[PDB]
Swiss-Prot record, chain B:
Record text on subunit structure and interactions: Component of the Mediator complex, which is composed of MED1, MED4, MED6, MED7, MED8, MED9, MED10, MED11, MED12, MED13, MED13L, MED14, MED15, MED16, MED17, MED18, MED19, MED20, MED21, MED22, MED23, MED24, MED25, MED26, MED27, MED29, MED30, MED31, CCNC, CDK8 and CDC2L6/CDK11. The MED12, MED13, CCNC and CDK8 subunits form a distinct module termed the CDK8 module. Mediator containing the CDK8 module is less active than Mediator lacking this module in supporting transcriptional activation.
UniProt short sequence motif LXXLL motif 2, positions renumbered to this chain: 333-337
Protein's UniProt name: Mediator of RNA polymerase II transcription subunit 24
Family: Belongs to the Mediator complex subunit 24 family.
Gene: MED24
Job of this protein: Component of the Mediator complex, a coactivator involved in the regulated transcription of nearly all RNA polymerase II-dependent genes. Mediator functions as a bridge to convey information from gene-specific regulatory proteins to the basal RNA polymerase II transcription machinery. Mediator is recruited to promoters by direct interactions with regulatory proteins and serves as a scaffold for the assembly of a functional preinitiation complex with RNA polymerase II and the general transcription factors.
Entry comment describing in which tissues the protein is expressed: Ubiquitous. Abundant in skeletal muscle, heart and placenta.
Organism: Homo sapiens
Whole-protein residues included: 4 to 371 of 989
Curated annotation (Swiss-Prot), chain C:
Subcellular location as annotated: Cytoplasm; Nucleus
Induction (free text): By 12-O-tetradecanoylphorbol-13-acetate (TPA).
Quaternary data: Component of the Mediator complex, which is composed of MED1, MED4, MED6, MED7, MED8, MED9, MED10, MED11, MED12, MED13, MED13L, MED14, MED15, MED16, MED17, MED18, MED19, MED20, MED21, MED22, MED23, MED24, MED25, MED26, MED27, MED29, MED30, MED31, CCNC, CDK8 and CDC2L6/CDK11. The MED12, MED13, CCNC and CDK8 subunits form a distinct module termed the CDK8 module. Mediator containing the CDK8 module is less active than Mediator lacking this module in supporting transcriptional activation.
UniProt superkingdom: Eukaryota
Function, in words: Component of the Mediator complex, a coactivator involved in the regulated transcription of nearly all RNA polymerase II-dependent genes. Mediator functions as a bridge to convey information from gene-specific regulatory proteins to the basal RNA polymerase II transcription machinery. Mediator is recruited to promoters by direct interactions with regulatory proteins and serves as a scaffold for the assembly of a functional preinitiation complex with RNA polymerase II and the general transcription factors. Required for cholesterol-dependent gene regulation.
Post-translational modification: Ubiquitinated by TRIM11, leading to proteasomal degradation.
Signal peptide: none
Species this chain originates from: Homo sapiens
Residues of the full protein shown: 674 to 785 of 788
Gene: MED15
UniProtKB/Swiss-Prot annotation, chain D:
Disease involvement: Intellectual developmental disorder, autosomal recessive 18, with or without epilepsy: A disorder characterized by significantly below average general intellectual functioning associated with impairments in adaptive behavior and manifested during the developmental period.
Role description: Required for transcriptional activation subsequent to the assembly of the pre-initiation complex. Component of the Mediator complex, a coactivator involved in the regulated transcription of nearly all RNA polymerase II-dependent genes. Mediator functions as a bridge to convey information from gene-specific regulatory proteins to the basal RNA polymerase II transcription machinery.
Subunit structure: Interacts with ELK1. Component of the Mediator complex, which is composed of MED1, MED4, MED6, MED7, MED8, MED9, MED10, MED11, MED12, MED13, MED13L, MED14, MED15, MED16, MED17, MED18, MED19, MED20, MED21, MED22, MED23, MED24, MED25, MED26, MED27, MED29, MED30, MED31, CCNC, CDK8 and CDC2L6/CDK11. The MED12, MED13, CCNC and CDK8 subunits form a distinct module termed the CDK8 module. Mediator containing the CDK8 module is less active than Mediator lacking this module in supporting transcriptional activation.
Family per similarity comment: Belongs to the Mediator complex subunit 23 family.
Curated annotation (Swiss-Prot), chain E:
Oligomeric and partner information: Interacts with ELK1. Component of the Mediator complex, which is composed of MED1, MED4, MED6, MED7, MED8, MED9, MED10, MED11, MED12, MED13, MED13L, MED14, MED15, MED16, MED17, MED18, MED19, MED20, MED21, MED22, MED23, MED24, MED25, MED26, MED27, MED29, MED30, MED31, CCNC, CDK8 and CDC2L6/CDK11. The MED12, MED13, CCNC and CDK8 subunits form a distinct module termed the CDK8 module. Mediator containing the CDK8 module is less active than Mediator lacking this module in supporting transcriptional activation.
Subcellular location(s) per record: Nucleus
Main function: Required for transcriptional activation subsequent to the assembly of the pre-initiation complex. Component of the Mediator complex, a coactivator involved in the regulated transcription of nearly all RNA polymerase II-dependent genes. Mediator functions as a bridge to convey information from gene-specific regulatory proteins to the basal RNA polymerase II transcription machinery.
Parent-record interval covered: 1174 to 1334 of 1368
Protein family according to the UniProt entry: Belongs to the Mediator complex subunit 23 family.
Entry protein name: Mediator of RNA polymerase II transcription subunit 23
Taxonomy of the source species: Eukaryota, Metazoa, Chordata, Craniata, Vertebrata
Length: 182, 360, 112, 179, 161
């Protein structure tokens, strides 16, 4: 209820400065039980927004970039605090989130959902640090949509190995076939 | 041999580029497969033999490159295995080869040999630096004997690099992804660069030295992996400290240090503004505080605990200059500081200054 | 895959071996193509990358022009001149077979 | 008027840059003999024919010819751009006309007077408004050519127009409270 | 004052701290913000004749002092919101204050190395031109724009031409 009725407030602000201030503040209002807030935000709210076709109009550009920043910050902060054990709920919800990212990137329809997912990817690249080595928790069947974030690049090269699971045998091939295009 | 013998069948039978193609198609049937090592190798040394590269044999190589015929990778390897002992213009011929090709590296197709392609690009970078070293030795022995004419021309060949994709996870990131199997080649980029440290600073050509240092930094930009005019101020750090004061005072210093480093990284907070916001939040919580038994909490927080947090932060990074700049920012806020002086009943910044100075 | 292009690709002449572009996702309305001439008589040239406006037929399949392909050499630039001219002549209803046939004629006429 | 113009049309229906320099020579004669007041309907019929051809390559090289006609000063920038982005044929549905049109406007917009840049920005924003909130995954990249012309008009390093005019038009077409 | 003349490196974004609506609800006010606040109320309630002293005050005793960029931004923040009052009753003081604003920009250009906030300055100037002054300040501003650094002239080109 908390995350829903605060993101619903963030998504109504029309001016850029206010949405950025709003997410900067929501990150700290959320630090209360950051872990569960991350679980619920990512799992139940971002798929709900990305799979409605009528909540899509809220993800427009001034409020959408803010929500993308907040989601990336939440994901990084929930993981960085205290093969990978898929029994940990955070890992399962991150896997589901990136699977949905994939299905949205490579889908017949494009719209504000595609732009929001690209923005989430761009931000996850920007604030990428040593903690989230593999685009934190890109699942093994993933890196298959690195090809899609290349075909729909709107983004410089060399961010894709930052995405890519480097230091891996299959990672070599996937990153190479990828950058071959862009 | 027999495959070499076709290039001879064009030794001075200046057949053409196109008739060369059709001849190759006839002679060695393309039924199963080819370009394992055949065309690039069979063409290279039969062209570069002796002083001048055979213009027509080199012409067919230019062709096969342009028509996406051989590999775009076996060509790089063939140029890599070239052994600069040819002190003559032939190196310039191979540079002319690299010209039209290097800027665009498609390698699209089976694309499994794309890791092979970055392997080849690494070997070609090694060959490039080796040619640079040979041409710089020619520069030096010419400063001894002969005025340079074409010594630095391979610098433009390095400027053919230095674009993103030419040095992106095509070259750089797959350079290390490749040293995962060819760590000797990472040591190779280090090693050629070691002797480059010897053969770089001695040259007296200023502009060329600057471009060479640029390429050398882009090599040192193999570790490669914004918003300078951060205008609005940083409110999330404010709220993070303020929450850590209100709800959870007794929480370990390590937890708050962890939370605060994260936010600084994610939002790229300049270190002067970080401490400004921490100290502003502490004071604001102190001023807007309940009267009796919560005020001690804010003051204990502000004056004892945040100092140890900043000490641990100093450990986790010129931090003295930085906190000095932060306090200079803070002193230039007379309203907040004077309300603090009012409420705390004593000079709230004289004390904070002495207390912060008492630590590291 | 539009399953009409499937037909036209099925019924072609063997020399024009055509596959779908590894780059892109042919899934969405228009499938890209990466077709590479063969045929013993000809001279191997650079591939021709096709794009079909899924509303096709009654929609000409785009060509992808690039001097990055042909600039180097004379044979290649002559190929490009002949190709662009003849393609401009092709009327208003191009089918993939029309493009590839035109390309074969262009290679051949450049061999002159 | 109409007859010789239709004749040039039948010609362009009936070495490529050489054919194009021949078409430019054909254009220059009619222009030297074209009236000074009927320029507007002239260009309107010109672009009307340009959009009729359903072949991406044909509209491509006709647009290249128009780029020479506007670059070599024979054709006024304001009139040609306004006509290009002011037509009834220009619809987001026909993706190829859209892509090529805005790739042309990007090139020739540099040089319109600042009043004309205001009018053009107004009409281009009005054109992007018609695009709905859901488009096929394929058209997106080509449709996004409008973002290119908007970006070039807006970028203050281009200083094509008074920035204040740009914000005035943008706000009139996007009042406070609407994304 | 040190707050704007020399120690400008320690006050942050000018457009921020020169607002006291915000920068107060979060206790980050400065003395300059207070003075600019009390100078908008005094001028809001004043009569037209009392503000008729603002044009003279801008040239005789403010034009020589203002050198740095923050000083120019401060003078703009003060006298800006009241062009709307000057225009409707006393049409000449607006011309004088426009001539003063451009002259102050000349001074701030002829004394600083890089006009960091060129974009907002030029924005406000174009706003002045298009909303209040119109085409009645051309002759006096032509000379002043002629003598700015090339970057400023590139932007303010359309004011006259």
């Amino acid at each position: 209820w908390f995350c829903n009725n605060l993101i619903k407030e963030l998504l109504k602000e029309t001016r850029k400065e206010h949405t950025l201030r709003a997410v900067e503040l929501l990150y700290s209002i959320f630090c209360l039980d950051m872990q569960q807030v991350t679980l619920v935000l990512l799992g139940h709210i971002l798929p709900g927004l990305l799979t409605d076709s009528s909540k899509w109009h809220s993800l427009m550009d001034p409020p959408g970039t803010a929500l993308a920043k907040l989601a990336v910050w939440c994901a990084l902060s929930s993981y960085s605090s205290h093969t990978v054990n898929m029994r940990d709920p955070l890992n399962r919800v991150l896997a589901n989130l990136f699977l949905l990212i994939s299905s949205i990137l490579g889908s017949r329809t494009a719209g504000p959902h595609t732009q929001f997912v690209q923005w989430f990817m761009e931000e996850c690249v920007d604030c990428l640090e040593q903690g989230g080595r593999g685009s934190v928790l890109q699942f093994m069947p993933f890196t298959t949509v690195s090809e899609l974030v290349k075909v729909s690049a709107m983004s410089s090269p060399k961010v894709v190995l930052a995405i890519t699971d480097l230091s891996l045998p299959l990672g070599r091939q996937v990153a190479a076939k990828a950058i071959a295009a862009l | 041999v027999n495959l070499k013998q076709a290039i001879l069948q064009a030794w001075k039978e200046r057949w053409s580029d196109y008739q060369w193609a059709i001849n190759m198609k006839k002679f060695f049937p393309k039924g199963a497969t080819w370009d394992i090592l055949n065309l690039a190798d069979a063409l290279l040394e039969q062209a570069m033999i002796g002083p001048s590269p055979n213009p027509l044999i080199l012409s067919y190589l230019k062709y096969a490159i342009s028509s996406q015929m051989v590999s775009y990778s076996s060509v790089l390897t063939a140029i890599s295995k070239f052994d600069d002992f040819s002190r003559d213009l032939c190196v310039q011929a191979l540079l002319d080869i690299m010209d039209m090709f290097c800027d665009r590296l498609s390698c699209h197709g089976k694309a499994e040999e794309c890791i092979g392609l970055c392997r080849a690009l690494l070997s070609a970078l090694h060959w490039l630096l080796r040619c640079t070293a040979a041409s710089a030795e020619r520069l030096r022995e010419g400063l001894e004997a002969g005025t340079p004419a074409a010594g630095e021309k391979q610098l433009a060949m390095c400027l053919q690099r230095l674009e993103k994709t030419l040095s992106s996870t095509k070259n750089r990131a797959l350079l290390h992804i490749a040293k995962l199997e060819e760590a000797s080649s990472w040591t190779a980029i280090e090693h050629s660069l070691l002797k480059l440290g010897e053969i770089l600073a001695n040259l007296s050509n200023p502009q060329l030295r600057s471009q060479a240092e640029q390429c050398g930094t882009l090599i040192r930009s193999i570790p490669t992996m914004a918003e300078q005019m951060h205008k609005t101020g940083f409110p999330t750090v404010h709220a993070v400290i303020l929450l850590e004061g209100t709800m959870n005072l007794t929480g370990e210093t390590q937890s708050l240090v962890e939370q605060l480093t994260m936010v600084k990284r994610m939002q790229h907070i300049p270190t002067p503004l970080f401490v400004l916001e921490i100290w502003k939040a502490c004071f604001v919580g102190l001023i807007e505080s309940p009267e009796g038994t919560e005020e001690l909490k804010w003051t204990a927080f502000t004056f004892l605990k945040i100092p140890q947090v900043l000490v641990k932060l100093k450990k986790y990074s010129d931090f003295t200059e930085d906190v000095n700049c932060a306090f200079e920012f803070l002193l230039k806020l007379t309203p907040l500081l004077d309300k603090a002086d009012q409420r705390c009943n004593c000079d709230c910044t004289n004390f904070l200054l002495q207390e912060c100075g008492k630590q590291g | 895959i539009p399953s009409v292009l499937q037909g036209e690709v099925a019924r072609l002449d063997p020399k024009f071996l055509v596959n779908l572009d590894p780059s892109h996702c042919s899934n969405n309305g228009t499938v890209h193509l990466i077709c590479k001439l063969d045929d013993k008589d000809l001279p191997s040239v650079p591939p021709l990358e096709l794009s079909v406006p899924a509303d096709y037929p009654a929609q000409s399949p785009l060509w992808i022009d690039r001097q990055w392909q042909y600039d180097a050499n004379p044979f290649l630039q002559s190929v490009h001149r002949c190709m662009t001219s003849r393609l401009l002549q092709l009327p208003d209803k191009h089918s993939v077979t029309a493009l590839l046939n035109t390309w074969a004629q262009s290679v051949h006429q450049a061999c002159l | 008027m109409e007859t010789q113009l239709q004749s040039i049309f039948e010609e362009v229906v009936k070495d490529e840059k050489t054919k194009l320099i021949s078409c430019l020579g054909a254009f220059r004669q009619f222009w030297g003999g074209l009236s000074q007041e009927s320029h507007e309907q002239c260009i309107q019929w010109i672009v009307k024919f340009i959009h009729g051809q359903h072949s991406p390559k044909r509209i491509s090289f006709l647009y290249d010819c128009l780029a020479m006609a506007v670059e070599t000063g024979l054709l006024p920038p304001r009139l040609v751009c306004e006509s290009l982005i002011n037509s009834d044929t220009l619809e987001w549905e026909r993706t190829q006309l859209w892509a090529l049109t805005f790739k042309l406007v990007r090139k020739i917009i540099g040089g319109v007077d600042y009043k004309g840049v205001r009018d053009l920005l107004k009409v281009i924003l009005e054109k992007i408004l018609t695009i709905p909130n859901t488009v096929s995954s394929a058209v997106v990249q080509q449709l996004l050519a409008a973002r290119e012309v908007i970006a070039y008009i807006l970028e203050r390093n281009a200083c094509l127009l008074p920035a204040y005019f740009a914000v005035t038009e943008i706000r009139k077409l996007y009042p406070e409270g609407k994304l | 004052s040190p707050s704007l003349t020399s120690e400008t490196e320690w006050v942050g974004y000018p457009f921020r701290l020169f607002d006291f609506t915000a920068c107060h609800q979060s206790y980050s006010e400065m003395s300059c913000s207070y003075t600019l606040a009390l100078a908008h109320a005094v001028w809001h309630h004043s009569s037209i004749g009392q503000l008729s002293l603002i044009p003279k005050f801008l040239t005789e005793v403010l034009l020589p002092i203002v050198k740095t960029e923050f000083q120019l931004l401060y003078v703009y923040h003060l006298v800006g919101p009241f062009l709307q009052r000057f225009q409707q009753e006393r049409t000449r003081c607006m011309i004088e204050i426009g001539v003063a604003f451009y002259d102050m920009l000349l001074n701030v250009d002829q004394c600083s190395t890089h006009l960091n906030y060129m974009d907002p300055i030029c924005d406000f100037l174009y706003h002045m031109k298009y909303m209040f002054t119109g085409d009645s300040v051309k002759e006096q501003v032509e000379k002043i724009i002629c003598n700015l650094k090339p970057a400023l002239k590139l932007r303010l080109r359309f004011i006259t031409h």
